[PDB]
Amino acid sequence: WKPFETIILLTIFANCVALAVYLPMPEDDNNSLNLGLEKLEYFFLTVF
Amino acid sequence: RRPWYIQGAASPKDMLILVDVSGSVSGLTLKLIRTSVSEMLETLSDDDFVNVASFNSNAQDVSCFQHLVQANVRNKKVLKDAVNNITAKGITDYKK
Numbered sequence: 001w002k003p004f005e006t007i008i009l010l011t012i013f014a015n016c017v018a019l020a021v022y023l024p025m026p027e028d029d030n031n032s033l034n035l036g037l038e039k040l041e042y043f044f045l046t047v048f
Numbered sequence: 049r050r051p052w053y054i055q056g057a058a059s060p061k062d063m064l065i066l067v068d069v070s071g072s073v074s075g076l077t078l079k080l081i082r083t084s085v086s087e088m089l090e091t092l093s094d095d096d097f098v099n100v101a102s103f104n105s106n107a108q109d110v111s112c113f114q115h116l117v118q119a120n121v122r123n124k125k126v127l128k129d130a131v132n133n134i135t136a137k138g139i140t141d142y143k144k
C-alpha cells in the first residue's frame with residue numbers, strides 16, 4: 001500500500017530508456033555503452 | 049599516381065596497412081576498404097616495403113608473408129588477392 005508503484009513505474013521508465021539507448025551492431029560487434037547496459041539489465045531483473 | 053611522380057615526391061617507405069575487420073565494418077564500407085587498400089597498394093614501388101595486417105579483437109596477417117615484403121608485382125598481387133578475401137566479424141580492438 002506504500003507508494004511502491006511509483007518507484008516501480010520509474011524503474012520501468014529507466015528500463016525503457018536503457019532499451020532505447022542500446023545501439024545494435026552488425027556481425028557480433030559491441031561498444032562500451034552496450035556492454036555497460038548488459039550489466040544494468042541485471043539490476044532490473046532482480047528488482048522485478 | 050605515375051611511378052616517376054611518386055618516386056620524385058617522397059623517399060621509400062616501410063608501409064603497414066592495418067585493416068579493421070570487426071563487425072561494424074560489414075557492408076558497403078568493407079568493399080570500399082578492399083578497393084581502397086588495392087588502390088593504395090597500387091601506389092607502391094619496388095623500393096617500398098609493405099605488409100597488410102588485420103585486427104578484430106585479435107591481430108593477424110592477411111596472407112602468408114608475416115613480415116614486410118619488397119612489394120613488387122607478385123607480392124602486391126598476393127596482398128591484393130588476400131585483401132579481396134576478408135570478411136567482417138568480431139569486436140574492434142585498436143590496442144592489439
Ligand SMILES: *[C@@H]1O[C@H](CO)[C@@H](O)[C@H](O)[C@H]1NC(C)=O
Nearest residue numbers: 110129130131132133134135
Ligand atoms: C580465399 O578465397 C578462396 C577462394 O579461392 C577460399 O577458398 C578461401 O576460403 C578464402 N580464404 C578465407 C580466409 O576465407
Ligand SMILES: [Ca+2]
Nearest residue numbers: 029070072140
Ligand atoms: Ca567497430
